[PDB]
Amino acid sequence: GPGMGASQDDYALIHKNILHSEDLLKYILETSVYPREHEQLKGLREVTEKHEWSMALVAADEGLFLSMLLKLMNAKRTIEIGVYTGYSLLTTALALPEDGKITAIDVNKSYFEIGLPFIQKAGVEHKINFIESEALPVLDQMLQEMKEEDLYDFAFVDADKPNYANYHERLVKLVRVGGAIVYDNTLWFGTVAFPEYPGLHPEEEECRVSFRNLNKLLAADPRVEISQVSIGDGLTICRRLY
Amino acid sequence: GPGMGASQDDYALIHKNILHSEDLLKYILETSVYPREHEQLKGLREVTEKHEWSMALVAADEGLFLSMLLKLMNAKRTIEIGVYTGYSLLTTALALPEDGKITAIDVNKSYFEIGLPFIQKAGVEHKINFIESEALPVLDQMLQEMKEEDLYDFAFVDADKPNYANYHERLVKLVRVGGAIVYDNTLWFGTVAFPEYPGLHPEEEECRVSFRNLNKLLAADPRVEISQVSIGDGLTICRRLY
Numbered sequence: 176g177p178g179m180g181a182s183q184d185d186y187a188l189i190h191k192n193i194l195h196s197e198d199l200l201k202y203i204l205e206t207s208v209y210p211r212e213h214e215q216l217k218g219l220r221e222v223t224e225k226h227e228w229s230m231a232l233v234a235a236d237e238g239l240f241l242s243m244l245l246k247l248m249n250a251k252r253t254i255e256i257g258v259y260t261g262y263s264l265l266t267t268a269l270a271l272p273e274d275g276k277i278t279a280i281d282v283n284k285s286y287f288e289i290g291l292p293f294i295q296k297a298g299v300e301h302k303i304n305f306i307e308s309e310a311l312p313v314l315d316q317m318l319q320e321m322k323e324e325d326l327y328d329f330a331f332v333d334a335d336k337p338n339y340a341n342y343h344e345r346l347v348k349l350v351r352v353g354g355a356i357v358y359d360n361t362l363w364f365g366t367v368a369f370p371e372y373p374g375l376h377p378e379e380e381e382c383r384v385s386f387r388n389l390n391k392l393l394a395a396d397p398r399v400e401i402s403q404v405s406i407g408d409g410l411t412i413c414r415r416l417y
Numbered sequence: 418g419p420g421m422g423a424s425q426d427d428y429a430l431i432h433k434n435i436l437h438s439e440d441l442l443k444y445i446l447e448t449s450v451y452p453r454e455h456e457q458l459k460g461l462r463e464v465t466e467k468h469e470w471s472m473a474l475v476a477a478d479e480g481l482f483l484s485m486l487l488k489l490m491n492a493k494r495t496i497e498i499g500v501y502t503g504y505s506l507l508t509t510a511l512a513l514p515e516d517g518k519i520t521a522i523d524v525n526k527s528y529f530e531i532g533l534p535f536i537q538k539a540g541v542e543h544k545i546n547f548i549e550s551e552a553l554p555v556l557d558q559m560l561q562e563m564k565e566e567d568l569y570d571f572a573f574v575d576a577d578k579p580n581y582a583n584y585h586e587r588l589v590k591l592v593r594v595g596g597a598i599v600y601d602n603t604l605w606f607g608t609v610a611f612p613e614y615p616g617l618h619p620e621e622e623e624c625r626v627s628f629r630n631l632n633k634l635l636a637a638d639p640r641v642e643i644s645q646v647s648i649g650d651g652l653t654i655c656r657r658l659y
């Protein structure tokens with residue numbers, strides 16, 4: 176109710192990691208990520224680390240992996256659901272060719288305005304069409320308008336976790352055959368490995384349950400082939416088969 | 418030569434994981450890997466788990482990830498360095514198109530013949546050209562005979578770890594521009610994070626130092642873009658730039 180509002184300090188999982196030690200994750204970042212990170216990504220990350228919802232920021236080693244996937248598959252048209260301050264969005268815009276196009280959807284444009292100066296300085300603002308809205312109505316409107324020529328090569332899903340299965344039903348129609356759908360956070364701080372987990376915030380527990388259900392659904396879905404990858408907070412790559 | 422024993426039982430790191438949770442790795446395998454694993458890959462994995470060098474076997478979640486990369490980049494011609502019983506090789510042969518081709522190099526064909534019945538039953542043996550040799554002389558012969566139109570789309574490097582830097586100098590000329598080179602085990606049980614790590618077999622220590630050097634070299638190499646991925650025992654994806 177009324178008060179000071181939602182803080183990430185009310186959450187139990189902030190300080191959890193899936194790798195063996197903090198030293199191993201720090202090694203990966205210092206050795207293989209920061210030397211390869213665009214200066215505008217570094218600036219965007221450093222401001223976002225000070226923000227009240229910094230827990231949501233995509234892991235930087237995951238960012239470089241998404242960039243690699245976009246280049247290897249020659250993606251040109253992508254969709255991002257869940258923008259926050261724009262780290263994965265700027266990563267994507269830097270990876271695409273000059274004529275690449277991104278549809279970016281987030282309910283809160285004020286977060287996006289934090290990252291927008293870095294996107295402009297990087298010279299890739301022209302690739303981004305940002306839409307301030309809940310994603311589900313936008314996706315349903317796309318399904319009535321988009322033709323086969325406009326299908327996306329790649330979707331990154333990093334928004335409200337309990338809605339992922341709902342996003343999946345739209346995205347298997349909005350991404351081309353042979354295209355990729357990537358779901359962030361599918362290992363949810365390691366909590367998915369347990370049928371019950373003590374002391375979580377109600378929203379954290381709702382996400383543990385939803386990801387356990389989502390991971391089973393994706394593994395059984397004949398419309399896609401999958402790979403769940405223990406990078407960052409876990410991601411699942413889906414490739415559309417038909 | 419004469420010296421100390423260097424069998425698998427002589428190594429210290431066999432059971433060490435890069436993920437901090439054994440339950441999380443089992444969850445990934447049981448939820449997202451085994452339901453998606455080809456029957457012949459399952460049989461090959463089960464035999465190899467009993468073999469005296471079972472620690473060398475590529476992780477099954479990494480297998481599905483490699484398959485996903487190959488499909489998303491539409492690879493058609495690949496090279497594998499380090500075959501063992503053939504798990505990554507069968508993964509690759511199953512992922513490629515019907516007319517895809519693999520050049521597979523290993524010093525020990527007897528290992529390959531353990532997995533060969535599974536590869537034959539999968540119906541993809543015809544894609545594989547197995548070469549029984551040390552890899553370095555083969556790659557140098559390829560540099561002499563390779564034409565630009567025959568460059569590989571994808572290379573998987575999983576053989577003798579101290580030689581990876583030597584392999585890299587040939588493979589950046591044998592893979593096409595825009596192609597991928599994947600180096601397996603670049604986190605080496607997490608020991609790369611530390612300048613010193615007590616209690617290692619001398620060959621394990623040699624690989625720790627070798628990978629610390631390689632990870633620095635790859636992060637600084639302008640010929641490639643990289644992404645180090647904390648799946649399996651760690652891998653590094655390189656994409657050739659010029």
Ligand SMILES: Nc1ncnc2c1ncn2[C@@H]1O[C@H](CSCC[C@H](N)C(=O)O)[C@@H](O)[C@H]1O
Binds near residue numbers: 232256261
């Ligand atoms: N229903 C909804 N539709 C669209 N965006 C939503 C949403 N519910 C939450 N979000 C947004 O999802 C985002 C999750 S954080 C996303 C992180 C970002 N991709 C990065 O690279 O760091 C938040 O910005 C939140 O505002």
Ligand SMILES: Nc1ncnc2c1ncn2[C@@H]1O[C@H](CSCC[C@H](N)C(=O)O)[C@@H](O)[C@H]1O
Binds near residue numbers: 524550
């Ligand atoms: N110099 C060399 N040239 C080619 N192969 C070598 C080599 N030194 C060692 N090897 C081979 O490298 C292999 C490493 S284990 C390879 C694992 C396999 N790719 C999998 O999917 O499980 C062993 O089979 C070993 O015989």
Ligand SMILES: O=Cc1ccc(O)c(O)c1
Binds near residue numbers: 230
């Ligand atoms: O909302 C919490 C949150 C936490 C971690 C994430 O990666 C994310 O996208 C969201």
Ligand SMILES: [Mg+2]
Binds near residue numbers: 231233333360
């Ligand atoms: Mg996320």
Ligand SMILES: [Mg+2]
Binds near residue numbers: 601
């Ligand atoms: Mg290996």
